Design an enzyme around this catalytic site. Sequence first.
Site, PDB file in Angstrom:
ATOM      1  N   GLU A  31       0.822  -1.211   0.000  1.00  0.00           N
ATOM      2  CA  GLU A  31       0.000   0.000   0.000  1.00  0.00           C
ATOM      3  C   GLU A  31       0.858   1.265   0.000  1.00  0.00           C
ATOM      4  OE1 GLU A  31      -3.208   0.470  -0.291  1.00  0.00           O
ATOM      5  OE2 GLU A  31      -3.965  -1.586  -0.193  1.00  0.00           O
ATOM      6  N   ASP A  32       1.820   1.313  -0.921  1.00  0.00           N
ATOM      7  CA  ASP A  32       2.707   2.448  -1.191  1.00  0.00           C
ATOM      8  C   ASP A  32       3.767   2.667  -0.122  1.00  0.00           C
ATOM      9  OD1 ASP A  32       1.013   2.851  -3.347  1.00  0.00           O
ATOM     10  OD2 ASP A  32      -0.150   4.380  -2.285  1.00  0.00           O
ATOM     11  N   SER A  33       3.932   1.759   0.827  1.00  0.00           N
ATOM     12  CA  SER A  33       5.085   1.881   1.696  1.00  0.00           C
ATOM     13  C   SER A  33       6.351   1.524   0.923  1.00  0.00           C
ATOM     14  CB  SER A  33       4.943   0.984   2.924  1.00  0.00           C
ATOM     15  OG  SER A  33       4.075   1.556   3.881  1.00  0.00           O
TER      16      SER A  33
END
Lengths: 1179, 56, 69, 45, 56, 48, 159
Positions: free
Chosen positions: A791-793
């Site tokens: 999730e875009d980490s």
Amino acid sequence: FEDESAPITAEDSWAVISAFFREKGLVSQQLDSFNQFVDYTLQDIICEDSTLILEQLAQHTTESDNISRKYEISFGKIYVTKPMVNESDGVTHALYPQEARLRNLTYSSGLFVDVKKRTYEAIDVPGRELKYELIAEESEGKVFIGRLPIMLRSKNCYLSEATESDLYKLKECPFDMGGYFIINGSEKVLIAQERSAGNIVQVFKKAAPSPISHVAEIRSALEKGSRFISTLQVKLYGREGSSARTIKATLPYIKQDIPIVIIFRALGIIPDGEILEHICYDVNDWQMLEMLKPCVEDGFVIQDRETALDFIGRRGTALGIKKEKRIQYAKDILQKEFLPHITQLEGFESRKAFFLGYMINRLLLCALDRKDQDDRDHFGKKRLDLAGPLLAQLFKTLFKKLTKDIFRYMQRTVEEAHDFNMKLAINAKTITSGLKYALATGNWGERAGVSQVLNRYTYSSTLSHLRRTNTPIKLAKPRQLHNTHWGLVCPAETPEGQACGLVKNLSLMSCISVGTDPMPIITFLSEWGMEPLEDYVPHQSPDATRVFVNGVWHGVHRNPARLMETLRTLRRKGDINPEVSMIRDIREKELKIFTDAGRVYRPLFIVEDDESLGHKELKVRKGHIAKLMATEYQDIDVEEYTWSSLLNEGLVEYIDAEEEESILIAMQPEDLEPAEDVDPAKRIRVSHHATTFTHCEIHPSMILGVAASIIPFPDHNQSPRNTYQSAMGKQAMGVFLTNYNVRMDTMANILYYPQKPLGTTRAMEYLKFRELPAGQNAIVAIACYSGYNQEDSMIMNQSSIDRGLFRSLFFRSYMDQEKKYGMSITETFEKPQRTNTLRMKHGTYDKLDDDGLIAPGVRVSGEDVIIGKTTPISPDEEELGQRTAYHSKRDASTPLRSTENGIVDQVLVTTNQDGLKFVKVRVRTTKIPQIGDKFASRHGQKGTIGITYRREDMPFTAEGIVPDLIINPHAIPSRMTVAHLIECLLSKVAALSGNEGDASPFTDITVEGISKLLREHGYQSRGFEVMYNGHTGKKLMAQIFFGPTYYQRLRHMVDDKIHARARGPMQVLTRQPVEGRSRDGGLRFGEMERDCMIAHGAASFLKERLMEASDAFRVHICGICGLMTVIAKLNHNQFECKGCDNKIDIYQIHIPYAAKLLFQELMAMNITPRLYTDRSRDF
Amino acid sequence: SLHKMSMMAHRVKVIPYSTFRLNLSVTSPYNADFDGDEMNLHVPQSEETRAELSQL
Amino acid sequence: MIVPVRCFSCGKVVGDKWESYLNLLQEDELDEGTALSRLGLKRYCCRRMILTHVDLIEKFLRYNPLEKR
Amino acid sequence: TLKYICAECSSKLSLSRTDAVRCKDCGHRILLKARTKRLVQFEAR
Amino acid sequence: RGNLMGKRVDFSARTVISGDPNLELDQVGVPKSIAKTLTYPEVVTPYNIDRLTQLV
Amino acid sequence: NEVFSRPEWMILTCLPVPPPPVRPSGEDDLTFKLADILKANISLETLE
Amino acid sequence: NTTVLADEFIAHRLGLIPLQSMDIEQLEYSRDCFCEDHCDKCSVVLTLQAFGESESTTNVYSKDLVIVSNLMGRNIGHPIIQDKEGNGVLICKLRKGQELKLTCVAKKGIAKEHAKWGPAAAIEFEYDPWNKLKHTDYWYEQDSAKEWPQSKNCEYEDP
DNA sequence: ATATTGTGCAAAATGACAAAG
RNA sequence: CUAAGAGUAC
DNA sequence: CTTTGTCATTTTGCAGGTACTCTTATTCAATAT
Ligand SMILES: [Mg+2]
Ligand SMILES: [Zn+2]
Ligand SMILES: [Zn+2]
Ligand SMILES: [Zn+2]
Ligand SMILES: [Zn+2]
């Protein structure tokens, strides 16, 4: 090369572009507009009006004093000096910008005007006309009328002629581009304000319910006059099905829509045939005549010019004109209010009648379905007011105020017979304070946000800010990216918030015209055969082209082709100013010329027949490119060849959106000019199968703006990703200026080790991005490694951080003055003592020495005092337990921010304009990346750090290389950021080979070639590498995409956002927690959070949030009247409601303090919200 | 917080870094990413509120 | 600002190769790749460490010292 | 007294509370306080 | 609307969020500083005299 | 209503003055408006 | 420090300077040494003192670091010099008149605490070059064998 | 010398107004 | 302190 | 003669939710005590 007249290649055009950016720069429009304002607009503002005549009549009771005096004051030339500063001691010396910035001064220069005071006298003989003569007192004597702030690097600034070494001596960064003002030590930039152009007839269809179907309007305005806006509208009453379709015009200062024929007869055109000829230019166009018959049937009752003038005057809203003078009144309205942009003089009634006929013709063409209603979003119909015109109209208003004040003072002193003094007449504070207020705060008057604090987070951020346009916010759709925006504003650079589409950014090669006098062009037209409009009869010249200059129909031409040819030739050889735009609409038989300011244009290559080669070819050849190359190399002995040389020799042309309607542009020379087995990897392109080009794009990649020009391979990305990167690169952390060490800015962020991109565009070496980079080349792996990058980490290498990846310096400056509360109530910088000071802060004062300032080198933490200041107060007061007459000083110290800490970098002591001492303390700290900090590629792939692994835990290739970053694969497919992958591949190839990847958008660089080069270097052609798991050393079943990629550290760090509050300061009014983390505030528990808690059904938690967590107030009411008017003495245990006269019918209730305040505000507003604790009715 | 699932009761786990940490599966009801999103935390102050938070 | 002491990824010391790199580029007229190979930078992590560096300290050195002794 | 440095001259000055803040050598009105004499400790990480 | 239907509250925190595959579905990771700031009032009882005394 | 709202109570003859809690202090805007009301009241009373 | 670089900037650069660690086992950790802050049994004290006396830029190298503490016969502390010119890492630069005086204390540490203590740089590590154990599934478009270049170690095993 | 006063829906409500008894 | 404005994050 | 429904005006109240930072400014000037 060897051949001087050989055609150029697509690679050659960059030389041309370089020449442009050598002559223009990035902020050419700002400096050009300001220079135009200072050089010419000030003098015009001064000379217009500004002749104060006061005719003191004789007022002779006896003939012995029958002399009438006339005192006039006139203003001559205006002188603007170099910027200088006054002083407390009175000494005046030259002021340099890196003194104004440090001392909070204003980089302003004084204005002087030559005032000539004349006086005339006449013999007051009744009946005889007065004759006025001089008394020989022709006194003249420059006087100081105020200060004009000077934009940096302008023609009137010290830095305009400075060389690089001089700039270094003056503590000025040579990369700084100027184009901004220094107001009170703050850098202010004027955002270009977008508006609709004036003197253009626009026809619009109206909605069905309205009785008017079509409206043709002009927003008439005159530049060399009062600059007043008068909106004329011509409206067609009746829907399509209706029968009484009568056209009526809306004249200014008139309460009714006069029929058009009445206006025409008033101007002097009595016969119906002549009016119809003025309106309709074709006898065969019987449809227009049929639609026009109702108007003449309406105005049949008036058959005389005087009658029509009387009819209009009767409708006059002034209602202060006698019956006989109505004619004159109407005449005045038709002379000075009807179509002002044409003329304010008399004897031009024919011209105004022709223009009105033209407007009616346009309206009828739109109503006859022969033409579509005018597009409100067409960018050629817009104008950008830059610093020039904004300061022009502001100064016009302010100087009108000052001259009105002068006239009032003169009248007062002559009436009171007091002496006259210019120094007491002129109040320079008027102009000075007006300009300083307008520039210091955005509000442009006495609009908002016209002037903004210049953004200095990153060099590209400053460049983008200096080229920003704002559109104030009809039935149009302004947010859309219009077709006419091509090559003038960035297709993808705009905020994602409410401003999306309204806030725009200029293209790299786009410029704004500054305006020129149209008289020479009018003389050219008159000499070359333009028939004057006065003796123009449409029937004898049916196929005549109407020539417009700045929206003023000046006449007609019978051979427009020759006229256009010679005008183009004159503009191409420099005789006409290149900014002038000339459009020829063949179908409408019109020729428009625009010379006014605010028009946005771009340069283009010129294409001519070139009979020698037998086909169309660019006018530019290899010889001109060679000369430009020679000049550039000499700059880094031959005759200088600059962009102006290309302009003068007719090689390049300036085209705006209006002229761009009437040309054909070739996208690239090498593929579209010459007359007509292909690489499958190259993208598909169409030859257009047409050879009538008039211009060629210098380079398509020039349609992008400053921020979009940094994106590598922007044509391989989804457009919203380009927009996101354009918005997000201004938040990139780099080196904003090279002289950051001598500037005391409020906040500054610097990378330790800025790196230029491995994948770089050709346009970014005019933006100095390689000199002032805002990112680093991190080794990135696209892998589902540990699940901590979902999730875009992102997973950042801890060992890379330890060695200096994305590390940063952060500087913060606290300013503090000592102010004179009275004549001898000066504040004092000192080390306050608990013995004789009030409200000393809970922080430690131990780090201050005896001047009240910490000395550079000392470590400071949160809440420690850095500036010690005290203010005197009135002594001899006793309270608080430990307040005595000794406490004559109140603490006014400045503590360090509660959350921040660091080393005091520097402290600067000086004096202000008033002469009072003040200080600036700059504290330095280091920001090291950590979990929660935000980083982004150049493709809108933003993300925070999820976790950091040391080198031994990261996956590694067979060569021992470990990634600096690991990003999730799932970020790729949905977002379709192919350019990210292509740039990673190109960066890997470039790092291996030592070259630099050319990631320009519209080049013929394919993934196939990059893959082949990578394969030649000994790696898998598609960037995959066999990696090994760090924990176990086993081979990963899947191969990992791996390579360098350019990442920016964004300004959003978690340590500037973390905030918690158990209990803290409460707002004084509502007794609720204060707002903001800077104030230890509380989090808002909004309405829909309450709704979610209701849906959950947790009533007690909702009550606890709204009462115990925010504000619980116990109040007393009485059972007779439900009001809170109960006097409660709790210690004495006595409750009593006066009025009700009761002392045992009292109750206490716990309600929110905001509720008690609401009930008291209801009572103060004469409403009784009686609260009762028992039911009086059944459910 | 468009629906009741965008406000839910969690169990505290004290961790040594400066961000809120949450399971990947619970991001869908919150409509939460990790590209800079911020979230809010409220602490009940009584046994009743604590209990109904844990049980509802 | 000034050449980093070590390569970020692997940790190879590259702070002592900046002057040699510039000397190779200028005096010997080698292209960047051959100079990087000559200095011993074989992994592209080190190659990007030295190839992409921007030496801003030179600009910083142009301004006159604030505290001059 | 307390030590300052002219922003332009770089000359060293000693100023008291009542002294006007100017450079004796050149008259510049911008002064920067001298470096502290107490040792400063930095972790080399 | 601004002070009664919704108001600012105490005992609340806010910060950036991160994913953690090693946390349970109903668990939330709380920074140590935030955990040290936000507090809960526990009533002293014979059952929790020892640990409350230790915390004090 | 006979007891809680009669029409003649829609006409103001005695303005209630909210306490300083409602208009805390630089005086509040309500305090300035109340001062203006008192000024106009005194002016009218003297003119009468 | 009258240079153009921040104090912690230079401190970070200095921490990254490689130092001789041959006899590091004879040094103690500062944490388990009985001195107060640092002593001779657990640290090496270096001193940097540079001045800009030349009209041209003066380069502060790591060879300028001088050991002040008594090494007691150990073989630790000396900055590692690798290039032929004899100048070590380029610590800083000085314009004329600029000065930089500072004292460094060096302790023994491991790369876990901070990467500046790592002596290893990159470590190539490979096994089974021919993929006979089938520990990877080779991504490919047309033919995996052609598209994946053979490792240099393939010569040391039978295909 | 300083305090004091000279914006675009879109529903609802309302008004004007030709036809009807 | 209050107010207004501007920029910005999701 | 007064309805009566009917259009064309007038009001008129609204316009996502949290959160962060910074900057300026607090009536100008003339008169009288
Ligand atoms: Mg998000
Ligand atoms: Zn009562
Ligand atoms: Zn390396
Ligand atoms: Zn000096
Ligand atoms: Zn020791």
